[PDB]
């Protein structure tokens, strides 16, 4: 029917999701359960393991810790910046695959990404997280929740809110095919500040939302109304973003021993 067009959209987004992102929820979950036959992730649980894992994590930057002035908390924060920037680039490529997205006003393409990318980063981060820690560097690291908490303030506060969101969001038991449509719905949000032409964005999001509803009914026929819980999580994502921007506000002030990557500067300029 029209529901055929909706299956086509879901499959296209899935294909583009698999191509755009190096580590899927399926592979991440296997790694976190040892149900893979790959070399396990190097566990970072303290300052020593970080030093030993520095290489495999690709958090190396210019020089190793022991020959650089920058302290451990700053080096982890800088490591996570390079991972974010790559995430932003992967999400931008995925967005361009969303039918109608490249035909939008370029200024609106920028605004959607500007407000969208970190809501998608945190959604995708949950795929990599459990109550104990997070896969880093395409699954070859595992950094513990306790280690990230133990970092001296305000750095100890950055990742904990993402763990708290992830434990809840992971209970919905979404798979990659579900997440591929959900992240597209997030990108095509009509209510982002500074949007010039909301109508074609709401038209595209209407389609993605229908596609997400069909996908949820088919892939979870045992399950019932994720869709509603799942749409409430979109507001949770905005709160994580708000909170996170405040923490970046603090560190810009309390630390002058660091600067933000330019792309992250573009994104955070005039944001909540």
């Amino acid at each position: 029917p029209e529901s055929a067009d909706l299956r086509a959209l879901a499959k296209h987004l899935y294909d583009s999701y698999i191509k755009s992102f190096p580590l899927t929820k399926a592979k991440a979950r296997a790694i976190l359960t040892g149900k893979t036959t790959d070399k396990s992730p190097f566990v970072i649980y303290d300052m020593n393991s970080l030093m030993m894992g520095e290489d495999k994590i690709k958090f190396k930057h210019i020089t190793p810790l022991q020959e650089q002035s920058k302290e451990v908390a700053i080096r982890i924060f800088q490591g996570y910046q390079f991972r974010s920037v790559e995430a932003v680039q992967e999400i931008t490529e995925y967005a361009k695959s969303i039918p109608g997205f490249v035909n939008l006003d370029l200024n609106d393409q920028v605004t959607l990404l500007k407000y969208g990318v970190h809501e998608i980063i945190y959604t995708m981060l949950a795929s990599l997280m459990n109550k104990d820690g997070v896969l880093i560097s395409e699954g070859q690291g595992f950094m513990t929740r306790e280690f990230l908490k133990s970092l001296r303030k305000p750095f100890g506060d950055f990742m904990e809110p993402k763990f708290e969101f992830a434990v809840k969001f992971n209970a919905l038991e979404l798979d990659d095919s579900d997440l591929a449509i959900f992240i597209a719905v997030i990108i095509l949000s009509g209510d982002r500040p500074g949007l010039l032409n909301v109508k074609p964005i709401e038209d595209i999001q209407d389609n993605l939302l229908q596609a997400l509803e069909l996908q949820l009914k088919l892939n979870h026929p045992e399950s019932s109304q994720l869709f509603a819980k799942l749409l409430q999580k979109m507001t949770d994502l905005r709160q994580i973003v708000t909170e996170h921007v405040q923490l970046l506000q603090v560190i810009k002030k309390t630390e002058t021993d660091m600067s933000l990557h330019p792309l992250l500067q573009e994104i955070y300029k005039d944001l909540y």
Binding site: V88, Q89, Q109, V110, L113, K114, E266
Partner: peptide, 11 residues
Amino acid sequence: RHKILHRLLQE
């Protein structure tokens, strides 16, 4: 204004 974002998009 959003130089890198424009570049990533216009790629």
